[PDB]
Amino acid sequence: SVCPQGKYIHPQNNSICCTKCHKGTYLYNDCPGPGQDTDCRECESGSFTASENHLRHCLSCSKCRKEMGQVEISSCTVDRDTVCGCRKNQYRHYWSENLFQCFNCSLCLNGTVHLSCQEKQNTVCTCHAGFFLRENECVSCSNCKKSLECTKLCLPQIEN
Amino acid sequence: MDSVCPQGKYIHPQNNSICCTKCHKGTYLYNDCPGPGQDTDCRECESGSFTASENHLRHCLSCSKCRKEMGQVEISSCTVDRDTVCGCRKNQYRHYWSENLFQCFNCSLCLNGTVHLSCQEKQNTVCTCHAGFFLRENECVSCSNCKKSLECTKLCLP
Ligand SMILES: [Mg+2]
């Protein structure tokens, strides 16, 4: 025994086919027989189900990582999980396959953009003569001092 | 901006004229350095938390927990500098409902059928059934099981 599309095989009796629960709800109890309803309860706050199903629990909403500078794009609803991301002018730096931190795309004031900021990489910015790139900005050489790793960048230029 | 630091150091939150060495991954910021030539007070992350990079976070990140109801299994446990890695069992594929949420499904074996593409890490086997069989419930079902309303009559004709 198999079931028609949209139905599932009863866990305790394989000769019974039950209709799946609508997204936004979860399986409270399997249907008791052919032509009888599957009992589906609405997901509690903080949980959801995005497709027709027969799960015994709704999924807990995903949480965004505030420490990584993440913001909530969309809030979690009974049939829609939380959507986490970054601001429009920010890019993502993945520390791992699914762990990303939001970083500001360099505006490159007093510099030349050689490659626009991308989804996963910062703007490629070349600061103009008299400035050096640090802390995502083009900083004036008048602030350069020993140990700031700027001495050579600030010395007269050389065509090497 | 005028006050900056060497790569590897961060600007002291109370005085931008002071730069402090960052904490290595696996540790977090206990206390900022008091000034030049003195250490930043960084301490190891406690049980269940981690930091994946050089930082100066006041708290470590909480490790992720694999979703058992989605049939997920732990591929790598969480360490002081690396979050837990979740996956599926052998002969199963991951169906991603979103970028960071996936469900484990069994790959179709395609018995009594033709495999066009083998099962992949994120998608099922592409299978079509031989004459006398019909695809349903991840398998090629014998047409002897075809019954009206099971949507298979025409597929089961000679
Ligand atoms: Mg910096």
Side-chain angles (χ1 to χ4, degrees):
Chain A
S1 292
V2 290
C3 297
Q5 187 54 70
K7 304 198 181 180
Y8 69 93
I9 304 171
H10 196 295
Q12 217 256 355
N13 185 347
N14 297 192
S15 61
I16 297 177
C17 292
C18 302
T19 297
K20 293 168 180 181
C21 288
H22 191 276
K23 58 183 68 65
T25 73
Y26 72 103
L27 184 79
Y28 181 71
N29 278 307
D30 296 288
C31 79
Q36 300 194 241
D37 277 15
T38 295
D39 286 338
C40 313
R41 179 174 177 264
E42 182 175 15
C43 292
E44 291 170 37
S45 59
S47 67
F48 75 98
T49 60
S51 48
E52 273 61 72
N53 69 92
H54 65 110
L55 295 172
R56 307 238 171 222
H57 306 85
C58 287
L59 292 64
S60 50
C61 301
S62 300
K63 288 187 285 281
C64 306
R65 299 219 185 252
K66 297 302 127 174
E67 308 84 358
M68 294 294 99
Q70 295 179 10
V71 299
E72 190 172 282
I73 300 308
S74 319
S75 56
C76 192
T77 70
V78 300
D79 60 12
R80 188 187 65 166
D81 190 14
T82 312
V83 175
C84 300
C86 304
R87 301 295 186 139
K88 163 173 64 177
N89 301 312
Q90 292 190 316
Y91 66 94
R92 299 178 186 192
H93 181 68
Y94 285 75
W95 290 115
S96 59
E97 199 183 333
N98 66 134
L99 179 67
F100 67 91
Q101 176 167 357
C102 298
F103 284 106
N104 287 349
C105 283
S106 180
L107 183 52
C108 203
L109 295 182
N110 281 320
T112 297
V113 174
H114 281 96
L115 188 50
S116 282
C117 192
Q118 300 187 348
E119 292 179 72
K120 300 171 197 174
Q121 75 167 39
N122 209 350
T123 305
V124 176
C125 177
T126 309
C127 297
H128 298 155
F131 298 87
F132 64 104
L133 189 70
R134 202 64 55 79
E135 327 302 352
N136 213 35
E137 309 286 343
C138 285
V139 182
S140 170
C141 280
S142 58
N143 301 298
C144 181
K145 63 177 174 180
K146 184 173 191 173
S147 304
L148 295 194
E149 309 171 334
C150 51
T151 295
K152 294 197 177 189
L153 295 169
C154 294
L155 284 178
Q157 292 307 265
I158 305 168
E159 185 181 31
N160 272 151
Chain B
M1 201 165 159
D2 294 359
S3 300
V4 304
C5 303
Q7 221 77 35
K9 293 201 183 181
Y10 70 89
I11 295 168
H12 189 295
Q14 258 68 37
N15 192 323
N16 70 1
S17 71
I18 296 167
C19 293
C20 302
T21 306
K22 290 178 183 181
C23 298
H24 305 313
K25 62 182 173 189
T27 71
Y28 69 105
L29 182 79
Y30 189 77
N31 275 309
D32 292 292
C33 77
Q38 287 180 288
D39 300 331
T40 299
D41 187 357
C42 307
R43 300 186 181 187
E44 183 190 74
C45 294
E46 290 167 12
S47 49
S49 70
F50 71 101
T51 51
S53 64
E54 214 81 85
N55 68 91
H56 66 105
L57 293 161
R58 298 288 179 175
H59 302 289
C60 300
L61 280 57
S62 54
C63 302
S64 295
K65 295 174 186 181
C66 299
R67 299 181 177 258
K68 298 180 62 181
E69 300 306 328
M70 284 294 99
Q72 304 181 357
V73 292
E74 197 168 284
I75 292 186
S76 291
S77 59
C78 188
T79 73
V80 288
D81 57 29
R82 193 182 57 198
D83 198 15
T84 318
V85 175
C86 305
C88 294
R89 297 181 167 83
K90 179 195 176 191
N91 301 320
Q92 287 195 312
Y93 62 92
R94 311 182 187 175
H95 183 64
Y96 280 76
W97 295 116
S98 66
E99 183 193 325
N100 196 208
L101 171 68
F102 67 91
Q103 184 169 2
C104 302
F105 286 96
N106 293 326
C107 300
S108 170
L109 294 182
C110 200
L111 299 192
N112 286 300
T114 298
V115 173
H116 299 258
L117 291 176
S118 299
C119 196
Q120 296 180 260
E121 185 190 278
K122 300 181 187 176
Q123 89 167 41
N124 203 3
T125 308
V126 172
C127 166
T128 53
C129 307
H130 290 149
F133 295 89
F134 69 96
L135 191 55
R136 187 68 53 70
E137 192 82 4
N138 213 40
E139 309 177 328
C140 289
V141 180
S142 174
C143 286
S144 60
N145 296 272
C146 171
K147 54 181 66 181
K148 178 152 185 174
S149 306
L150 186 52
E151 322 160 318
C152 49
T153 307
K154 197 186 176 180
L155 295 181
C156 294
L157 284 175

